[PDB]
């Protein structure tokens, strides 16, 4: 093997962040999931299958 | 590490030329290793040295 990281490359590498972005869903979004939730309840959602 | 800077007209780092140290004595051995290096740190320039 020969494996390597960025902290020897470290003191020069600018600096990298994550951010989190939550988006609410669409009116029609949320009735479209609820009907397919709906829909797989009926299906049972294969969830054993 | 006894490297050849012939036909090397680019520039490699320290750690590149830790990297190509080690990969040497692969060939100088007969051995085949992985080189799981970070990505961004120049693999291809260790190739092609
Ligand atoms: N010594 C160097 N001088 C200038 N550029 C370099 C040097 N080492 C690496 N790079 C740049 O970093 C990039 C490394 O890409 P590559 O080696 O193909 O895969 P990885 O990004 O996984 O190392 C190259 O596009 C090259 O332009
Ligand atoms: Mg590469």
Redesign the pocket.
Same mark, same amino acid.
């Given at each position: 093997l020969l494996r390597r990281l960025k902290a020897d490359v470290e003191k020069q590498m600018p600096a990298k962040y994550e951010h989190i972005v939550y988006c609410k869903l669409s009116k029609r979004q949320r009735f479209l999931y609820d009907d397919f939730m709906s829909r797989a309840q009926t299906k049972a959602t294969l969830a054993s299958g | 590490d006894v490297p050849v800077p012939s036909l090397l007209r =680019?520039? %490699?780092?320290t750690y #590149?030329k830790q990297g190509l140290n080690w990969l040497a004595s692969l060939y100088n051995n007969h051995t085949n290793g992985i080189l799981a290096?970070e990505? =961004? %740190? =120049?693999?291809?320039? #260790?190739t092609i040295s």
């Open positions: - | =680019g520039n %490699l780092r #590149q290096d990505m =961004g %740190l =120049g693999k291809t320039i #260790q």
